[PDB]
Design a protein around this ligand. Sequence first.
Ligand code: W3Z
Lengths: 300, 237
Amino acid sequence: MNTVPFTSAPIEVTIGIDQYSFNVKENQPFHGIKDIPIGHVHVIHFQHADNSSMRYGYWFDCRMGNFYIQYDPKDGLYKMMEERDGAKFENIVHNFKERQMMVSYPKIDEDDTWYNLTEFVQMDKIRKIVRKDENQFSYVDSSMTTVQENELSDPAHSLNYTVINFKSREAIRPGHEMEDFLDKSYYLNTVMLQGIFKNSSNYFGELQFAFLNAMFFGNYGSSLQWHAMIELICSSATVPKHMLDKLDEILYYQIKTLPEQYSDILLNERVWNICLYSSFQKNSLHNTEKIMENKYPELL
Amino acid sequence: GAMNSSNYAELFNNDIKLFVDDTNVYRVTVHKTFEGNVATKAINGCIFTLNPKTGHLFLKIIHTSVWAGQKRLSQLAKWKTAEEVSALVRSLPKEEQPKQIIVTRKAMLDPLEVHMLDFPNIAIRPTELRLPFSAAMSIDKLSDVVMKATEPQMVLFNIYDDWLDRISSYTAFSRLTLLLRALKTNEESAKMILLSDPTITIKSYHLWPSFTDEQWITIESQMRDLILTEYGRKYNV
Ligand SMILES: CCOC(=O)[C@H]1CCCN(S(C)(=O)=O)C1
Protein backbone atom coordinates (compact mmCIF):
# COMPACT_ATOMS: atom_id res chain seq x y z
CA MET A 1 0.00 0.00 0.00
CA ASN A 2 1.35 3.47 -0.95
CA THR A 3 0.69 7.11 -0.12
CA VAL A 4 0.15 10.41 -2.20
CA PRO A 5 0.68 13.11 0.52
CA PHE A 6 -0.26 16.85 0.23
CA THR A 7 1.94 19.89 1.42
CA SER A 8 -1.48 21.49 2.54
CA ALA A 9 -5.09 22.28 1.14
CA PRO A 10 -5.24 26.06 0.72
CA ILE A 11 -8.48 26.30 -1.28
CA GLU A 12 -11.80 24.55 -1.00
CA VAL A 13 -11.80 21.60 -3.36
CA THR A 14 -13.42 18.29 -3.98
CA ILE A 15 -10.68 15.67 -4.41
CA GLY A 16 -11.11 12.41 -6.27
CA ILE A 17 -9.05 9.27 -6.08
CA ASP A 18 -10.15 6.69 -8.68
CA GLN A 19 -13.95 6.45 -8.25
CA TYR A 20 -13.91 7.86 -4.71
CA SER A 21 -14.20 11.55 -3.73
CA PHE A 22 -14.48 13.77 -0.64
CA ASN A 23 -14.90 17.47 0.13
CA VAL A 24 -12.02 19.41 1.68
CA LYS A 25 -12.65 22.86 3.19
CA GLU A 26 -10.40 25.89 2.73
CA ASN A 27 -7.34 25.49 4.95
CA GLN A 28 -8.61 22.24 6.52
CA PRO A 29 -5.52 20.00 8.38
CA PHE A 30 -5.26 17.55 5.38
CA HIS A 31 -1.99 15.85 4.23
CA GLY A 32 -3.38 13.52 1.61
CA ILE A 33 -4.42 9.90 0.92
CA LYS A 34 -2.91 6.54 2.19
CA ASP A 35 -3.46 2.82 1.59
CA ILE A 36 -3.60 3.27 -2.19
CA PRO A 37 -3.50 -0.31 -3.76
CA ILE A 38 -0.27 -1.10 -5.52
CA GLY A 39 -0.43 -2.72 -8.92
CA HIS A 40 -2.87 -0.47 -10.73
CA VAL A 41 -2.73 2.93 -12.43
CA HIS A 42 -4.53 5.55 -10.44
CA VAL A 43 -5.89 9.00 -11.06
CA ILE A 44 -6.23 11.75 -8.46
CA HIS A 45 -8.35 14.66 -9.60
CA PHE A 46 -9.72 17.98 -8.52
CA GLN A 47 -12.78 20.25 -8.80
CA HIS A 48 -12.50 23.61 -7.04
CA ALA A 49 -15.47 24.78 -4.97
CA ASP A 50 -15.38 28.25 -6.52
CA ASN A 51 -14.91 27.44 -10.19
CA SER A 52 -16.54 24.15 -11.13
CA SER A 53 -15.00 24.89 -14.53
CA MET A 54 -11.90 22.83 -15.24
CA ARG A 55 -11.88 19.39 -13.68
CA TYR A 56 -8.20 18.31 -13.77
CA GLY A 57 -6.21 15.31 -12.53
CA TYR A 58 -3.07 13.26 -12.65
CA TRP A 59 -2.63 9.64 -13.85
CA PHE A 60 0.14 7.84 -11.95
CA ASP A 61 1.57 4.55 -10.60
CA CYS A 62 3.04 4.22 -7.15
CA ARG A 63 5.68 1.80 -8.39
CA MET A 64 7.17 4.54 -10.62
CA GLY A 65 8.25 6.77 -7.74
CA ASN A 66 7.09 8.91 -4.77
CA PHE A 67 4.55 11.58 -5.95
CA TYR A 68 3.07 14.37 -3.62
CA ILE A 69 0.57 17.34 -4.20
CA GLN A 70 1.45 21.00 -3.11
CA TYR A 71 -0.86 23.79 -4.23
CA ASP A 72 0.52 26.39 -6.59
CA PRO A 73 -0.92 29.82 -5.87
CA LYS A 74 0.51 31.37 -9.08
CA ASP A 75 -0.93 28.77 -11.45
CA GLY A 76 -3.91 28.11 -9.15
CA LEU A 77 -3.99 24.38 -9.01
CA TYR A 78 -3.00 21.41 -6.99
CA LYS A 79 0.11 20.08 -8.77
CA MET A 80 1.59 16.58 -8.73
CA MET A 81 5.38 16.68 -7.84
CA GLU A 82 8.00 13.85 -7.49
CA GLU A 83 10.85 13.89 -4.95
CA ARG A 84 14.05 11.77 -5.19
CA ASP A 85 14.87 11.83 -1.44
CA GLY A 86 13.31 8.53 -0.40
CA ALA A 87 14.31 9.00 3.33
CA LYS A 88 12.92 12.56 3.67
CA PHE A 89 9.72 11.08 2.06
CA GLU A 90 9.12 7.82 4.09
CA ASN A 91 9.76 9.74 7.41
CA ILE A 92 7.62 12.84 6.54
CA VAL A 93 4.73 10.61 5.39
CA HIS A 94 5.20 8.60 8.57
CA ASN A 95 4.83 11.95 10.61
CA PHE A 96 1.32 12.59 9.09
CA LYS A 97 0.22 8.93 9.35
CA GLU A 98 1.09 9.41 13.08
CA ARG A 99 -0.94 12.60 13.45
CA GLN A 100 -3.61 10.87 11.29
CA MET A 101 -3.88 13.72 8.73
CA MET A 102 -4.54 11.44 5.66
CA VAL A 103 -7.78 9.77 4.45
CA SER A 104 -7.77 6.03 3.67
CA TYR A 105 -8.25 4.89 0.06
CA PRO A 106 -11.50 3.13 1.02
CA LYS A 107 -11.46 -0.10 -0.88
CA ILE A 108 -14.05 -2.72 -0.03
CA ASP A 109 -12.52 -6.16 -0.45
CA GLU A 110 -15.34 -7.74 -2.47
CA ASP A 111 -15.09 -4.84 -4.92
CA ASP A 112 -13.05 -5.22 -8.07
CA THR A 113 -14.43 -2.11 -9.83
CA TRP A 114 -11.06 -0.37 -10.18
CA TYR A 115 -9.27 -3.43 -11.42
CA ASN A 116 -12.09 -3.96 -13.90
CA LEU A 117 -12.01 -0.35 -15.21
CA THR A 118 -8.19 -0.36 -15.51
CA GLU A 119 -7.35 -4.01 -16.39
CA PHE A 120 -5.45 -3.15 -19.57
CA VAL A 121 -4.36 0.38 -18.72
CA GLN A 122 -0.60 0.82 -18.26
CA MET A 123 1.34 3.95 -17.44
CA ASP A 124 3.72 3.26 -20.31
CA LYS A 125 0.93 3.83 -22.83
CA ILE A 126 -0.73 6.68 -20.97
CA ARG A 127 2.54 8.59 -21.20
CA LYS A 128 2.53 8.14 -25.02
CA ILE A 129 -1.00 9.58 -25.31
CA VAL A 130 -0.32 12.44 -22.86
CA ARG A 131 3.13 13.58 -23.96
CA LYS A 132 5.18 15.19 -21.16
CA ASP A 133 8.27 13.20 -20.38
CA GLU A 134 10.04 15.11 -17.61
CA ASN A 135 7.27 13.70 -15.39
CA GLN A 136 6.35 10.10 -14.46
CA PHE A 137 2.71 11.15 -13.98
CA SER A 138 0.29 12.47 -16.61
CA TYR A 139 -1.81 15.66 -16.37
CA VAL A 140 -5.32 15.68 -18.01
CA ASP A 141 -8.25 18.16 -17.87
CA SER A 142 -11.74 18.93 -19.19
CA SER A 143 -10.69 21.04 -22.12
CA MET A 144 -7.67 19.29 -23.56
CA THR A 145 -8.18 18.43 -27.26
CA THR A 146 -7.20 15.30 -29.22
CA VAL A 147 -4.73 14.83 -32.10
CA GLN A 148 -7.69 14.17 -34.35
CA GLU A 149 -9.68 17.23 -33.22
CA ASN A 150 -6.80 19.62 -34.03
CA GLU A 151 -6.96 18.08 -37.51
CA LEU A 152 -10.51 19.44 -37.86
CA SER A 153 -4.84 23.75 -31.72
CA ASP A 154 -1.98 23.48 -29.19
CA PRO A 155 -0.19 20.12 -29.71
CA ALA A 156 1.73 19.97 -26.41
CA HIS A 157 -1.58 19.92 -24.50
CA SER A 158 -3.09 17.31 -26.83
CA LEU A 159 -4.30 13.78 -26.14
CA ASN A 160 -2.49 11.83 -28.89
CA TYR A 161 -5.11 9.07 -29.11
CA THR A 162 -4.95 6.64 -32.06
CA VAL A 163 -6.80 8.14 -35.00
CA ILE A 164 -9.86 6.13 -36.16
CA ASN A 165 -11.84 7.33 -39.18
CA PHE A 166 -14.31 5.07 -40.93
CA LYS A 167 -14.42 7.11 -44.16
CA SER A 168 -10.68 7.19 -44.65
CA ARG A 169 -8.18 5.53 -46.90
CA GLU A 170 -6.51 3.79 -43.95
CA ALA A 171 -9.86 2.13 -43.20
CA ILE A 172 -11.03 1.35 -46.78
CA ARG A 173 -9.14 -1.00 -49.19
CA PRO A 174 -9.23 0.21 -52.81
CA GLY A 175 -11.49 -2.23 -54.63
CA HIS A 176 -13.29 -3.29 -51.42
CA GLU A 177 -15.03 0.09 -50.83
CA MET A 178 -18.44 -1.38 -49.92
CA GLU A 179 -17.02 -4.49 -48.25
CA ASP A 180 -14.67 -2.67 -45.95
CA PHE A 181 -17.24 -0.03 -45.00
CA LEU A 182 -20.03 -2.40 -43.96
CA ASP A 183 -17.57 -4.95 -42.39
CA LYS A 184 -14.68 -3.20 -40.72
CA SER A 185 -12.95 -6.48 -39.81
CA TYR A 186 -10.02 -5.58 -42.07
CA TYR A 187 -9.56 -2.20 -40.38
CA LEU A 188 -9.93 -3.65 -36.88
CA ASN A 189 -7.84 -6.79 -37.25
CA THR A 190 -5.12 -5.95 -39.79
CA VAL A 191 -4.78 -2.17 -39.62
CA MET A 192 -5.37 -1.56 -35.93
CA LEU A 193 -4.83 -4.83 -34.03
CA GLN A 194 -2.03 -6.37 -36.11
CA GLY A 195 -0.71 -3.04 -37.38
CA ILE A 196 -0.96 -0.22 -34.79
CA PHE A 197 -1.87 -1.75 -31.39
CA LYS A 198 -0.15 -5.15 -31.93
CA ASN A 199 -2.47 -6.94 -29.50
CA SER A 200 -5.95 -6.54 -28.09
CA SER A 201 -4.63 -5.53 -24.67
CA ASN A 202 -3.08 -2.24 -25.89
CA TYR A 203 -6.27 -1.62 -27.83
CA PHE A 204 -8.49 -2.35 -24.82
CA GLY A 205 -6.23 -0.21 -22.71
CA GLU A 206 -6.67 2.91 -24.88
CA LEU A 207 -10.39 2.17 -24.87
CA GLN A 208 -10.41 2.08 -21.09
CA PHE A 209 -8.30 5.22 -20.68
CA ALA A 210 -10.55 7.19 -23.08
CA PHE A 211 -13.63 6.28 -21.14
CA LEU A 212 -12.08 7.18 -17.76
CA ASN A 213 -10.97 10.63 -19.01
CA ALA A 214 -14.49 11.17 -20.38
CA MET A 215 -16.05 10.26 -17.06
CA PHE A 216 -13.71 11.94 -14.58
CA PHE A 217 -12.99 15.08 -16.65
CA GLY A 218 -15.92 15.14 -19.00
CA ASN A 219 -13.35 15.33 -21.80
CA TYR A 220 -15.39 15.31 -24.95
CA GLY A 221 -12.58 14.15 -27.29
CA SER A 222 -12.01 11.14 -25.00
CA SER A 223 -15.71 10.18 -25.19
CA LEU A 224 -15.49 10.34 -28.97
CA GLN A 225 -12.47 7.98 -28.92
CA TRP A 226 -14.19 5.56 -26.44
CA HIS A 227 -17.21 5.47 -28.69
CA ALA A 228 -15.22 5.12 -31.93
CA MET A 229 -13.26 2.10 -30.61
CA ILE A 230 -16.41 0.37 -29.48
CA GLU A 231 -18.02 1.07 -32.80
CA LEU A 232 -15.12 -0.41 -34.80
CA ILE A 233 -15.39 -3.81 -33.03
CA CYS A 234 -19.20 -4.01 -33.10
CA SER A 235 -19.15 -3.12 -36.82
CA SER A 236 -16.61 -5.92 -37.45
CA ALA A 237 -18.08 -9.23 -38.54
CA THR A 238 -14.92 -11.12 -37.58
CA VAL A 239 -13.54 -10.54 -34.06
CA PRO A 240 -11.62 -13.10 -31.99
CA LYS A 241 -13.94 -14.84 -29.54
CA HIS A 242 -11.88 -13.72 -26.55
CA MET A 243 -12.06 -10.04 -27.50
CA LEU A 244 -15.82 -10.27 -27.79
CA ASP A 245 -16.03 -11.77 -24.32
CA LYS A 246 -13.62 -9.32 -22.72
CA LEU A 247 -15.25 -6.35 -24.40
CA ASP A 248 -18.60 -7.36 -22.86
CA GLU A 249 -17.00 -7.37 -19.38
CA ILE A 250 -15.19 -4.09 -20.04
CA LEU A 251 -18.20 -2.07 -21.15
CA TYR A 252 -20.31 -3.66 -18.46
CA TYR A 253 -18.28 -2.12 -15.76
CA GLN A 254 -17.93 1.26 -17.51
CA ILE A 255 -21.69 1.50 -17.82
CA LYS A 256 -21.89 0.28 -14.19
CA THR A 257 -19.65 3.06 -12.84
CA LEU A 258 -21.11 5.93 -14.86
CA PRO A 259 -23.02 8.52 -12.81
CA GLU A 260 -26.70 8.09 -13.55
CA GLN A 261 -27.20 11.83 -14.08
CA TYR A 262 -24.38 12.02 -16.65
CA SER A 263 -25.83 9.63 -19.22
CA ASP A 264 -27.22 12.45 -21.38
CA ILE A 265 -23.84 13.78 -22.57
CA LEU A 266 -21.37 10.89 -22.24
CA LEU A 267 -23.41 8.19 -24.00
CA ASN A 268 -24.00 8.35 -27.72
CA GLU A 269 -27.39 7.05 -28.83
CA ARG A 270 -26.40 6.06 -32.37
CA VAL A 271 -23.31 4.12 -31.35
CA TRP A 272 -25.12 2.11 -28.66
CA ASN A 273 -28.38 1.37 -30.45
CA ILE A 274 -26.14 0.15 -33.29
CA CYS A 275 -23.67 -1.93 -31.26
CA LEU A 276 -26.46 -3.47 -29.26
CA TYR A 277 -29.20 -3.99 -31.87
CA SER A 278 -27.93 -3.65 -35.45
CA SER A 279 -24.23 -4.48 -35.64
CA PHE A 280 -22.69 -7.87 -36.30
CA GLN A 281 -22.11 -8.22 -32.54
CA LYS A 282 -25.68 -7.40 -31.45
CA ASN A 283 -25.83 -10.83 -29.76
CA SER A 284 -22.36 -10.90 -28.26
CA LEU A 285 -22.62 -8.31 -25.42
CA HIS A 286 -25.01 -9.97 -23.03
CA ASN A 287 -23.96 -8.32 -19.76
CA THR A 288 -23.42 -4.89 -21.37
CA GLU A 289 -26.84 -5.06 -23.06
CA LYS A 290 -28.57 -6.41 -19.95
CA ILE A 291 -27.41 -3.55 -17.73
CA MET A 292 -27.98 -0.81 -20.31
CA GLU A 293 -31.62 -1.93 -20.71
CA ASN A 294 -32.18 -2.06 -16.89
CA LYS A 295 -30.59 1.33 -16.21
CA TYR A 296 -30.89 3.42 -19.38
CA PRO A 297 -33.84 2.11 -21.46
CA GLU A 298 -34.72 5.76 -22.16
CA LEU A 299 -31.80 6.17 -24.56
CA LEU A 300 -32.76 3.01 -26.44
CA GLY B 1 -23.92 21.86 -47.88
CA ALA B 2 -27.42 20.93 -49.00
CA MET B 3 -28.91 22.31 -52.21
CA ASN B 4 -32.33 24.01 -52.23
CA SER B 5 -34.48 26.81 -53.68
CA SER B 6 -32.36 29.47 -51.99
CA ASN B 7 -28.98 28.51 -53.45
CA TYR B 8 -30.66 27.55 -56.73
CA ALA B 9 -28.48 29.58 -59.13
CA GLU B 10 -25.15 28.02 -58.00
CA LEU B 11 -25.86 25.23 -60.48
CA PHE B 12 -25.22 27.54 -63.40
CA ASN B 13 -21.95 29.21 -62.36
CA ASN B 14 -18.63 28.16 -63.83
CA ASP B 15 -17.60 25.53 -61.26
CA ILE B 16 -18.05 22.20 -62.90
CA LYS B 17 -20.69 20.12 -61.20
CA LEU B 18 -22.73 16.96 -61.69
CA PHE B 19 -26.04 15.67 -60.40
CA VAL B 20 -26.25 11.96 -59.88
CA ASP B 21 -29.63 10.20 -59.87
CA ASP B 22 -29.82 6.45 -58.99
CA THR B 23 -33.57 5.70 -59.05
CA ASN B 24 -33.42 3.72 -62.30
CA VAL B 25 -30.24 1.69 -61.66
CA TYR B 26 -31.96 -1.39 -60.07
CA ARG B 27 -35.27 -1.95 -61.85
CA VAL B 28 -37.50 -4.97 -61.33
CA THR B 29 -40.74 -6.58 -62.45
CA VAL B 30 -42.44 -8.33 -59.54
CA HIS B 31 -44.25 -11.51 -60.66
CA LYS B 32 -45.78 -14.71 -59.28
CA THR B 33 -43.95 -18.05 -59.29
CA PHE B 34 -45.54 -21.36 -60.24
CA GLU B 35 -45.89 -22.20 -56.55
CA GLY B 36 -47.84 -18.96 -56.08
CA ASN B 37 -45.00 -16.99 -54.46
CA VAL B 38 -43.51 -13.73 -55.72
CA ALA B 39 -40.15 -13.22 -57.42
CA THR B 40 -38.45 -10.23 -58.98
CA LYS B 41 -36.97 -10.27 -62.46
CA ALA B 42 -34.47 -7.46 -63.10
CA ILE B 43 -34.37 -5.38 -66.29
CA ASN B 44 -31.69 -2.97 -67.48
CA GLY B 45 -31.07 0.31 -65.58
CA CYS B 46 -29.01 3.57 -65.88
CA ILE B 47 -27.18 6.06 -63.73
CA PHE B 48 -28.29 9.53 -64.74
CA THR B 49 -25.21 11.69 -64.21
CA LEU B 50 -25.82 15.22 -65.52
CA ASN B 51 -24.01 18.57 -65.92
CA PRO B 52 -26.87 21.07 -65.29
CA LYS B 53 -24.83 23.90 -66.98
CA THR B 54 -23.83 22.27 -70.34
CA GLY B 55 -26.60 19.69 -70.42
CA HIS B 56 -24.08 16.81 -71.00
CA LEU B 57 -25.66 13.56 -69.77
CA PHE B 58 -23.37 10.58 -68.89
CA LEU B 59 -25.94 7.84 -69.34
CA LYS B 60 -24.29 4.77 -67.71
CA ILE B 61 -26.19 1.55 -68.70
CA ILE B 62 -26.49 -0.95 -65.90
CA HIS B 63 -26.96 -4.38 -67.47
CA THR B 64 -28.98 -7.00 -65.54
CA SER B 65 -25.90 -9.22 -65.54
CA VAL B 66 -24.36 -7.10 -62.83
CA TRP B 67 -26.82 -8.45 -60.28
CA ALA B 68 -26.24 -12.16 -60.98
CA GLY B 69 -25.74 -14.02 -57.73
CA GLN B 70 -25.77 -10.92 -55.52
CA LYS B 71 -27.69 -10.32 -52.31
CA ARG B 72 -29.26 -7.10 -50.96
CA LEU B 73 -29.51 -5.66 -54.46
CA SER B 74 -31.19 -2.35 -53.46
CA GLN B 75 -28.19 -1.79 -51.19
CA LEU B 76 -25.63 -2.90 -53.78
CA ALA B 77 -27.22 -0.63 -56.40
CA LYS B 78 -26.11 2.40 -54.34
CA TRP B 79 -22.48 1.12 -54.10
CA LYS B 80 -22.48 0.15 -57.79
CA THR B 81 -23.73 3.71 -58.60
CA ALA B 82 -20.95 5.17 -56.50
CA GLU B 83 -18.35 2.91 -58.17
CA GLU B 84 -19.42 3.88 -61.71
CA VAL B 85 -19.52 7.59 -60.84
CA SER B 86 -15.96 7.46 -59.40
CA ALA B 87 -14.67 5.67 -62.54
CA LEU B 88 -16.30 8.30 -64.74
CA VAL B 89 -14.50 10.99 -62.75
CA ARG B 90 -11.19 9.09 -63.06
CA SER B 91 -11.57 8.84 -66.81
CA LEU B 92 -12.03 12.59 -67.18
CA PRO B 93 -9.07 14.94 -67.64
CA LYS B 94 -8.36 16.93 -64.49
CA GLU B 95 -9.65 20.19 -66.01
CA GLU B 96 -12.97 18.42 -66.56
CA GLN B 97 -13.45 16.72 -63.19
CA PRO B 98 -16.30 18.25 -61.17
CA LYS B 99 -15.65 20.34 -58.09
CA GLN B 100 -19.02 19.23 -56.78
CA ILE B 101 -21.31 16.25 -57.06
CA ILE B 102 -24.97 16.52 -56.00
CA VAL B 103 -26.79 13.24 -55.26
CA THR B 104 -30.52 13.35 -55.56
CA ARG B 105 -31.10 10.78 -52.83
CA LYS B 106 -29.38 11.11 -49.43
CA ALA B 107 -28.71 7.37 -49.20
CA MET B 108 -25.94 7.95 -51.82
CA LEU B 109 -23.81 10.29 -49.70
CA ASP B 110 -21.77 7.60 -47.89
CA PRO B 111 -21.28 5.27 -50.86
CA LEU B 112 -19.97 8.05 -53.01
CA GLU B 113 -17.89 9.71 -50.33
CA VAL B 114 -16.14 6.35 -49.74
CA HIS B 115 -15.61 5.76 -53.47
CA MET B 116 -14.27 9.32 -53.82
CA LEU B 117 -11.77 9.19 -50.91
CA ASP B 118 -9.06 9.81 -53.57
CA PHE B 119 -10.87 13.08 -54.56
CA PRO B 120 -10.94 15.12 -51.34
CA ASN B 121 -11.26 18.41 -53.20
CA ILE B 122 -14.60 17.28 -54.72
CA ALA B 123 -17.53 18.03 -52.48
CA ILE B 124 -20.29 15.53 -52.26
CA ARG B 125 -23.65 17.22 -51.54
CA PRO B 126 -27.31 16.22 -50.96
CA THR B 127 -30.33 18.24 -51.88
CA GLU B 128 -33.69 19.29 -50.45
CA LEU B 129 -35.28 19.50 -53.87
CA ARG B 130 -37.68 16.81 -55.07
CA LEU B 131 -36.28 16.72 -58.63
CA PRO B 132 -37.97 14.51 -61.30
CA PHE B 133 -35.01 12.80 -62.87
CA SER B 134 -36.58 9.42 -62.24
CA ALA B 135 -38.74 10.21 -65.21
CA ALA B 136 -35.70 10.07 -67.44
CA MET B 137 -36.87 6.65 -68.74
CA SER B 138 -40.00 8.24 -70.09
CA ILE B 139 -37.70 9.78 -72.72
CA ASP B 140 -38.04 7.21 -75.50
CA LYS B 141 -34.57 7.40 -77.01
CA LEU B 142 -33.11 6.98 -73.46
CA SER B 143 -35.43 4.09 -72.60
CA ASP B 144 -34.62 2.51 -75.92
CA VAL B 145 -30.86 2.51 -75.53
CA VAL B 146 -31.16 1.06 -72.01
CA MET B 147 -33.56 -1.78 -72.86
CA LYS B 148 -31.61 -2.76 -75.96
CA ALA B 149 -28.12 -2.90 -74.39
CA THR B 150 -26.55 -6.34 -74.23
CA GLU B 151 -23.48 -5.51 -72.12
CA PRO B 152 -22.49 -2.65 -69.80
CA GLN B 153 -22.18 0.56 -71.84
CA MET B 154 -21.80 4.34 -71.38
CA VAL B 155 -23.77 6.54 -73.77
CA LEU B 156 -23.26 10.29 -74.03
CA PHE B 157 -26.18 12.60 -74.70
CA ASN B 158 -26.95 16.30 -74.42
CA ILE B 159 -30.26 16.52 -72.62
CA TYR B 160 -30.84 20.05 -73.86
CA ASP B 161 -30.58 19.20 -77.59
CA ASP B 162 -29.65 22.62 -79.13
CA TRP B 163 -31.51 24.79 -76.63
CA LEU B 164 -28.44 26.59 -75.36
CA ASP B 165 -28.07 28.29 -78.78
CA ARG B 166 -31.10 30.38 -77.91
CA ILE B 167 -31.63 30.22 -74.12
CA SER B 168 -29.55 30.34 -70.94
CA SER B 169 -28.66 27.31 -68.84
CA TYR B 170 -30.99 28.52 -66.06
CA THR B 171 -33.88 28.50 -68.53
CA ALA B 172 -32.89 25.18 -70.10
CA PHE B 173 -32.84 23.49 -66.74
CA SER B 174 -36.25 24.91 -65.88
CA ARG B 175 -37.65 23.47 -69.15
CA LEU B 176 -36.03 20.09 -68.52
CA THR B 177 -37.49 19.83 -65.01
CA LEU B 178 -40.86 21.08 -66.12
CA LEU B 179 -40.89 18.45 -68.84
CA LEU B 180 -39.79 15.63 -66.53
CA ARG B 181 -42.18 16.65 -63.77
CA ALA B 182 -45.09 16.41 -66.19
CA LEU B 183 -43.88 13.06 -67.55
CA LYS B 184 -43.68 11.79 -63.98
CA THR B 185 -47.17 12.93 -62.93
CA ASN B 186 -49.07 11.77 -66.03
CA GLU B 187 -46.85 10.17 -68.64
CA GLU B 188 -49.57 9.55 -71.24
CA SER B 189 -50.72 13.16 -71.34
CA ALA B 190 -47.22 14.61 -71.16
CA LYS B 191 -46.34 12.57 -74.22
CA MET B 192 -49.57 13.42 -76.04
CA ILE B 193 -48.59 17.08 -75.63
CA LEU B 194 -45.10 16.66 -76.98
CA LEU B 195 -46.22 14.79 -80.12
CA SER B 196 -49.73 15.96 -80.94
CA ASP B 197 -48.78 17.90 -84.09
CA PRO B 198 -47.15 15.43 -86.53
CA THR B 199 -45.51 18.38 -88.32
CA ILE B 200 -42.99 18.93 -85.49
CA THR B 201 -40.29 16.29 -85.49
CA ILE B 202 -37.42 15.02 -83.33
CA LYS B 203 -34.13 15.36 -85.09
CA SER B 204 -32.28 12.08 -85.15
CA TYR B 205 -29.46 13.57 -83.06
CA HIS B 206 -31.88 15.04 -80.47
CA LEU B 207 -34.25 13.79 -77.80
CA TRP B 208 -37.08 16.29 -77.93
CA PRO B 209 -39.06 17.85 -80.76
CA SER B 210 -37.82 20.76 -82.75
CA PHE B 211 -40.20 23.45 -81.41
CA THR B 212 -39.84 27.08 -82.32
CA ASP B 213 -39.67 29.49 -79.37
CA GLU B 214 -43.37 30.26 -79.63
CA GLN B 215 -44.23 26.62 -79.76
CA TRP B 216 -42.10 26.08 -76.62
CA ILE B 217 -44.15 28.65 -74.68
CA THR B 218 -47.39 26.96 -75.78
CA ILE B 219 -45.82 23.65 -74.84
CA GLU B 220 -44.52 24.88 -71.49
CA SER B 221 -47.94 26.31 -70.64
CA GLN B 222 -49.65 23.02 -71.43
CA MET B 223 -47.24 21.15 -69.18
CA ARG B 224 -47.87 23.52 -66.25
CA ASP B 225 -51.64 23.04 -66.64
CA LEU B 226 -51.09 19.25 -66.54
CA ILE B 227 -48.93 19.45 -63.44
CA LEU B 228 -51.49 21.68 -61.66
CA THR B 229 -54.44 19.45 -62.57
CA GLU B 230 -52.97 16.05 -61.64
CA TYR B 231 -52.41 17.84 -58.33
CA GLY B 232 -56.13 18.58 -58.25
CA ARG B 233 -57.09 15.16 -59.60
CA LYS B 234 -54.86 13.83 -56.84
CA TYR B 235 -55.87 16.20 -54.02
CA ASN B 236 -59.36 17.31 -55.10
CA VAL B 237 -59.11 21.13 -55.17
C1 W3Z C 1 4.33 20.26 6.37
C2 W3Z C 1 4.31 20.33 4.87
O1 W3Z C 1 4.73 19.06 4.49
C3 W3Z C 1 5.45 18.80 3.38
O2 W3Z C 1 5.72 19.76 2.72
C4 W3Z C 1 5.89 17.39 3.02
C5 W3Z C 1 4.66 16.42 2.67
C6 W3Z C 1 4.83 16.11 1.26
C7 W3Z C 1 6.07 15.27 1.28
N1 W3Z C 1 7.24 16.11 1.33
S1 W3Z C 1 8.66 15.59 0.77
C8 W3Z C 1 8.49 13.97 0.57
O3 W3Z C 1 9.50 15.87 1.82
O4 W3Z C 1 8.95 16.13 -0.50
C9 W3Z C 1 6.97 17.49 1.91
